[PDB]
Design a binder for this molecule. Sequence first.
Ligand SMILES: Nc1ncnc2c1ncn2[C@@H]1O[C@H](COP(=O)(O)OP(=O)(O)OP(=O)(O)O)[C@@H](O)[C@H]1O
Lengths: 295, 147, 147, 98
Amino acid sequence: MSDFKVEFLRNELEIPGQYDGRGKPLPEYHVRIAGFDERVTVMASLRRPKRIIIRGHDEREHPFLVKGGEDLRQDQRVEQLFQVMNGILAQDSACSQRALQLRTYSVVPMTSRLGLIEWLENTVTLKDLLLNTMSQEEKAAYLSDPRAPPCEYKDWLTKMSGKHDVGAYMLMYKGANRTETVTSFRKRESKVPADLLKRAFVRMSTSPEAFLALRSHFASSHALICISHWILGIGDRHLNNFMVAMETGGVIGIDFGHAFGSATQFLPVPELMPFRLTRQFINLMLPMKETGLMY
Amino acid sequence: WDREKRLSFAVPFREMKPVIFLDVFLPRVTELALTASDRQTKVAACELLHSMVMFMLGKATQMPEGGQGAPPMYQLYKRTFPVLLRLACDVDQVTRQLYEPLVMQLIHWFTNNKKFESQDTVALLEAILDGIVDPVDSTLRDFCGRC
Amino acid sequence: WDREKRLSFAVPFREMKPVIFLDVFLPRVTELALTASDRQTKVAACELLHSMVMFMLGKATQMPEGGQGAPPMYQLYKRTFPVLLRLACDVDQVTRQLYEPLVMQLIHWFTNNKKFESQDTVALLEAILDGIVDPVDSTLRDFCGRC
Amino acid sequence: QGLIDENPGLQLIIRNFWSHETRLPSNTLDRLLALNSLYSPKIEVHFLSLATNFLLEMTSMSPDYPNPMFEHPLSECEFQEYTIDSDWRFRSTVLTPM
Ligand SMILES: Nc1ncnc2c1ncn2[C@@H]1O[C@H](COP(=O)(O)OP(=O)(O)OP(=O)(O)O)[C@@H](O)[C@H]1O
């Protein structure tokens, strides 16, 4: 990665996977590698993938995710799908009139154990965004200073008859009568701060007209993603697995190691929920339930 | 144009010191200064933007925060430098006599013992080296070359 | 103690803003803060010098001048740092609880990404490494070692 | 002469009497000019501290009196409250191993 430069006796490497079916290509206009750079960092999530940087002959950055050991064949195929969903969405009146499209993005399965997955620049994950709306005083409730889990959940497992951290859920579904689990879940759902995402968009927005619009596109793009993720049975909708496209303010559903029902098939902790409509989204729509614009 | 309010400006009253954040005025004042067809509006919108970019440089140079991320106002500089070029070689001669010297003045300041390494100058350089490219203006490119 | 007046301080009046140059008070206030035998004078002379060295750091950090010679207030720093040591480990416990933390606080600030190369820190280092030598005090040397 | 009086309570009432904006003017020039009338030699050892106590305390009401001198701190850092013993003590008065 230090040794690679533009030199003769080498086929100049066009930037990976930039070729697509959207019109005739103009191949020589596609970016090509000038070189790698003396910079790296590792992402927090369990396979510790890597924010590599490429400089192109355009004298421009392509920050990129290397992911690997996981086979990007599945991730490529779950995007072919999303490209054809943008296809029908652009091509029926009920969705062209609403300007409805997902964002897909480029996977490229560079080997059976790699891909250079494109980083969307000027974006942040929804958990990063959420904590970034908190003050140091509510952040104490995730530093886990008021109780050893952020909300009581891991310790409250003992009241729910579950002892250990992993798999103990396998017991609670036995005696989890509606009344005790709802009333205790409602006590936690009512602990964690009000109006966090309302605060996120008030911070983004210039003025009330710009807020009303930005709100609607987040909730619209979010809505379309969560049905289409359901349609292909994807799961593990963890709050790092969404990004706010921070310029346009829309949601992007980020990754798919558990596509095609395979999230809920895998035994040790079953996923009952088909997709995500949680509290800070209901709180984003507050004066009307999810039965409004989302529905 | 920014994630959090820069330009916090205390209005000189006698009883009190209420605060205006001037970075709400730029998105409209920049459009007036270029595109106002009424000439008297245009020049007054320029001298507001001039005094407001003087305010900008000063407030940044008090070091409201010293790096450790996006330098304060880099996100403004990235958005106001291309406006400053398009508006030096504006037609209106009263505008040109005000901003040709100001861009060269900025261009001097943005080479300096500390600041030559700053992303303030990266934003500046890539603004001007997008300036020379412009697909719809012949006089912008000449100016950006001389810049 | 200096060739030209640093510390130009505009008194907060309602009609007007007259200017005091505070660097005339130091030569007497430093002597009071150490050597005043009346205890009530002593502590009040300390909290003036504390607030006046807070003023000092701030006024220098606005960059009244950025080098190109003796840094502004280096000549004050060279004269006030040895006073600050002698006056942390003063006997009087009300004085000690005010200046032991302040010298460690200064000593943190005077290591930093820009300022670690500054003669502000050379003056500081050579003040403390004259502190450990003192031929007539046993407790100053211990403190300057811990510094 | 009541302006040097031995009891700090009466010393304060006569100070507060002259400080009033009808006894002794509020604009800084006429205050500075008027203070020359607040003298007779029996006060002289105290006078300079009184004249300055009448000028700076005109700032006790000024719009800048509660403003910060510099807007923000030296860099990213965080601050706390504190307390000082200030009661009965000079350091050199209690034995080591106790
Ligand atoms: N397009 C993207 N733009 C920016 N960040 C991304 C993007 N795609 C993935 N990430 C980052 O990569 C990290 C993990 O890799 P990725 O999401 O692709 O695979 P994953 O199987 O879901 O990994 P993991 O389960 O560990 O989160 C994410 O947590 C996120 O920080």
